Amino acid sequence: HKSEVAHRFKDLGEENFKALVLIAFAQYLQQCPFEDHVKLVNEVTEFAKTCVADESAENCDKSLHTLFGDKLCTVATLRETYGEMADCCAKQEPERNECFLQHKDDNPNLPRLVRPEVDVMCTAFHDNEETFLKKYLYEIARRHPYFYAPELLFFAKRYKAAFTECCQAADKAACLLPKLDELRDEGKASSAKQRLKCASLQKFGERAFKAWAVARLSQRFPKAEFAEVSKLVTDLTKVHTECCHGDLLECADDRADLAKYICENQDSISSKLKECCEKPLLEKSHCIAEVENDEMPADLPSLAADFVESKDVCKNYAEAKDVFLGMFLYEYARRHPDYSVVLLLRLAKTYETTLEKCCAAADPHECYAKVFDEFKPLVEEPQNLIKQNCELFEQLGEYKFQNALLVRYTKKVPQVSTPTLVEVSRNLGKVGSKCCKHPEAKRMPCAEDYLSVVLNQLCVLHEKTPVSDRVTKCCTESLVNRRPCFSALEVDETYVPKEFNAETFTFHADICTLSEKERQIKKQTALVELVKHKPKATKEQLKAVMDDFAAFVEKCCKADDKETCFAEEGKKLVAASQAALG
Ligand SMILES: CCCCc1ccc(S(=O)(=O)Nc2ccc(NC(=O)CCC(=O)Nc3ccc(NS(=O)(=O)c4ccc(CCOC)cc4)c(C(=O)O)c3)cc2C(=O)O)cc1
Ligand SMILES: CCCCCCCCCCCCCC(=O)O
Ligand SMILES: CCCCCCCCCCCCCC(=O)O
Ligand SMILES: CCCCCCCCCCCCCC(=O)O
């Protein structure tokens, strides 16, 4: 194509082109104000329009990396604000773009993004919708410089749909706020998952990444042959490697090529890709990534014929260990879409460890004939935990389920700071909301997906404030041992009770006014502090203090003199609670 900027403008359309140009510049120039970014986007959009009219016009034959880099180097505040980043401008392409990628800031130290009042947001959305939605993209993109720009554009369209529906409703806050909370959580999980996949690829290598992708793709495309799944794994691994390097254009072209290959070979891959493959270039790969699991070939043989009974089990294994183990993963995964990827990797690691020992023996068959008996306890351990926790979640609800988790894990790791225990237990309860709603066959893959971000948040929050050797041990374990290590945590019986502080257990009239989330956090902070002060208190002793606390809040938020009630009845509650647990 003669003018790459014109080709992108025509394939994306004016609306998507402007949104992606704003995201790209916001991610590199994180300190510049919104209005300066609007000026850069208008100048780039107009230049792209002169190139769609006449592809031979001045600068239209330049690469998009050259045009983008040229515009970054016209920024007045470049050396003053970004320092070393202005030195990238003295270099030629491709070294200039490589230099700019290295100087992106993962923590730009910007103020917390404050959600305004609902009436204020709806009035701004009505008066200048165009600016309101571009300010969303600007504020999110500048805070997440490595979030894949077209993925951030999908979240932006869901953000618009929440205001379009809820600002016309009778109760605007009751409609909009649960939608903005769900979107905030899903956006943060998406940002964490994108970073996690790159960190795993770098810290554990290409071999481990490929085994995960074989298991995940075999569950999604069970009718595809092993050779087809293996090729898609190699292509997907290359796409992730170049996407993790950080260049938006190399990443986007890589994803489009893979989506085009999948859409040409649909009969060899899946019967669920017809609608995805008709969608435009921007949506196509995103649609394929979230495609429904295709039905597995009806009438499949037992895994014993190829992996236990056959005479060539150890001959096939020695010939190419990774290929044979990948075939076991493919065969096991396509039959079990209900399993987590890590459970499938544990079964393949168990099967690998077995063949390493048994293939050296004189009669290998006699040594590994009972290998499938070892898989039963590994499969049932996460299945029973999900059933037990989902039946507890159904009985208590998200908030009371979060409270049961707070008491349990404060007793296990009481050295972890109260904000980290509150934050992680609240998110663990949110895992129960998003995954216990799905049926049995969809719960373990969902739980694995959200626990991977929740447990990584716990590990990142813990290493900056390291307090528990056991949390450090579970965080530095292999990926298949992380969750089982945390499940193995014992109650810290040698913890010395924290000294009592009256200010901690003092409540005020503001708890009556606070939002549901801010009110819950206050009570959950006090609950963790109560458990740290009295770690040996039983569930019946803590339940009495929690019921007495609830009745106290019930009474003082109805009283005429609320400030006097919270002060007088609160002194009695704290003293009676200390005596009950003394
Ligand atoms: C089950 C667990 C799900 C939630 C979760 C997921 C992931 C984690 S984590 O692993 O600790 N990681 C993160 C933990 C925190 C963050 N947060 C940030 O970087 C702060 C910036 C940020 O994302 N802000 C944000 C982003 C989106 C939001 N939701 S929103 O509805 O889109 C929104 C955006 C903007 C406004 C208007 C502002 O007007 C001035 C109103 C609503 C909101 C919000 O509603 O307040 C806020 C990012 C990550 C990350 O993924 O890098 C923690 C919790
Ligand atoms: C989300 C941003 C990072 C992108 C990493 C590349 C992912 C490409 C997925 C293409 C779809 C293949 C099928 C599938 O993932 O199930
Ligand atoms: C394209 C196919 C290559 C990948 C095949 C997977 C082979 C290795 C599986 C070993 C068992 C899981 C443990 C691990 O390696 O992390
Ligand atoms: C030293 C003990 C002082 C008394 C502690 C009172 C605070 C307990 C808070 C418990 C909150 C449980 C949740 C709820 O009631 O909704």
Swiss-Prot record:
Substitution effect: residue 175 to F: In Hawkes bay
Domain Albumin: 1-184, 185-377, 378-575
Record keywords, A-Z: Calcium, Cleavage on pair of basic residues, Copper, Disease variant, Disulfide bond, Glycation, Glycoprotein, Lipid-binding, Metal-binding, Methylation, Phosphoprotein, Repeat, Secreted, Signal, Zinc
Top-level taxon of origin: Eukaryota
Entry GO MF terms: antioxidant activity; copper ion binding; DNA binding; enterobactin binding; exogenous protein binding; fatty acid binding; identical protein binding; protein-folding chaperone binding
Outcome after substituting residue 65 to A: Impairs metal binding
Site keyed Not glycated: positions: 2, 18, 39, 62, 71, 91, 104, 134, 157, 172, 179, 188, 193, 203, 210, 238, 260, 272, 284, 357, 370, 387, 400, 412, 430, 434, 464, 473, 498, 517, 522, 536, 539, 555, 558, 562, 572
Protein's cellular compartments: Secreted
Residues recorded as bearing Phosphothreonine in the entry: 81, 418, 420
Gene3D superfamilies membership: 1.10.246.10
List of residues that carry Phosphoserine: 3, 56, 63, 271, 417, 487
Positions contributing to Ca(2+) 1 binding: 4, 242, 247, 250
Keyword Secreted: yes
Organ and tissue specificity: Plasma.
Glycosylated residues, chain numbering: 10, 49, 135, 160, 197, 223, 231, 274, 279, 311, 315-316, 321, 349, 376, 411, 437, 442, 492, 523, 532, 534, 543, 571
Short name of one Pfam family: Serum_albumin
GO BP annotation list: cellular response to calcium ion starvation; cellular response to starvation; negative regulation of mitochondrial depolarization
Outcome of mutating residue 534 to E: In Castel di Sangro
Residues marked Aspirin-acetylated lysine (site): 197
First-listed, main subcellular location of the protein, grouped into a coarse class: secreted
N6-succinyllysine modified-residue sites: 203, 434, 517, 562
Listed GO CC annotations: blood microparticle; cytoplasm; endoplasmic reticulum; endoplasmic reticulum lumen; extracellular exosome; extracellular region; extracellular space; Golgi apparatus
Disease: Hyperthyroxinemia, familial dysalbuminemic: A disorder characterized by abnormally elevated levels of total serum thyroxine (T4) in euthyroid patients. It is due to abnormal serum albumin that binds T4 with enhanced affinity. Analbuminemia: A rare autosomal recessive disorder manifested by the presence of a very low amount of circulating serum albumin. Affected individuals manifest mild edema, hypotension, fatigue, and, occasionally, lower body lipodystrophy (mainly in adult females). The most common biochemical finding is hyperlipidemia, with a significant increase in the total and LDL cholesterol concentrations, but normal concentrations of HDL cholesterol and triglycerides.
Family of this protein: Belongs to the ALB/AFP/VDB family.
Subunit structure: Interacts with FCGRT; this interaction regulates ALB homeostasis. Interacts with TASOR. In plasma, occurs in a covalently-linked complex with chromophore-bound alpha-1-microglobulin with molar ratio 1:2 and 1:1; this interaction does not prevent fatty acid binding to ALB.
Protein name: Albumin
Organism per entry: Homo sapiens (Human)
